[PDB]
Design a protein around this ligand. Structure first.
Ligand code: SF4
Length: 206
């Protein structure tokens, strides 16, 4: 009776789950978005990564992490010696929440409410049950709070392996790559290195 739960089929098959998510009305976000954007990757993945939501580019590509933030993430993964093809990558909410500004060049993402996060969480549970990751990288506040609690602060736990969640994977909470796109150069460079560090922490979990 709550959120997305009745839309989630009784299967662990990612293709079947993704097709079912296309029909989800578990919160209001499906109305204005173009389509649901499920995770991408396969069930043998050892590392799962979770962002906030599909953004402007993802909403139309049908795939996660395809815009500028995704390209920065690619650069960090490559520096961390992680093959993106070996990951399962998804988002805490699966429809893009947005507005437009006059004269703008893109649709501007808006923050999912905690209510929407909890509504969509049945999909995330299904993904985690399906993939059985050894480690989950939580990219940004929304994703980190989705698994670690609404009071959790990413900024206060950088580099730490956390454990609370299906399968009891290790959890590593880090900054979202979109936050690394802008700011003064030295700050962006230090922040990029810290993202690489946290990805390496995740990859070194045994
Ligand atoms: S954001 Fe999640 S719960 Fe809300 S309609 Fe989309 S798939 Fe369903």
């Amino acid at each position: 009776m709550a959120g997305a739960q009745d839309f989630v089929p009784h299967t662990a098959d990612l293709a079947e789950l993704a097709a079912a998510a296309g029909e989800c009305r578990g919160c209001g976000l499906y109305r204005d978005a173009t389509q649901a954007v499920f995770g991408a990757g396969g069930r043998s993945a050892r590392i799962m990564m979770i962002g906030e939501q599909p953004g402007d580019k993802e909403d139309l590509a049908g795939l996660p992490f395809v815009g500028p933030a995704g390209r920065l993430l690619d650069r960090a993964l490559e520096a961390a010696d992680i093959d993106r093809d070996a990951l399962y990558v998804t988002n805490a909410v699966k429809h893009f929440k947005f507005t437009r500004a006059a004269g703008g060049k893109r649709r501007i993402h808006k923050t999912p409410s905690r209510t929407e996060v909890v509504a969509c969480r049945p999909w995330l549970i299904a993904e985690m049950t399906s993939v059985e990751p050894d480690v989950v990288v939580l990219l940004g506040a929304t994703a980190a709070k989705a698994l670690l609690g609404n009071d959790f602060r990413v900024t206060q736990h950088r580099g730490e392996v956390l454990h609370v969640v299906p399968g009891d994977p290790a959890l590593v909470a880090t900054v979202h790559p979109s936050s690394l796109l802008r700011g003064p150069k030295e700050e962006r460079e230090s922040a990029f290195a810290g993202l690489v560090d946290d990805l390496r922490v995740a990859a070194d979990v045994r």
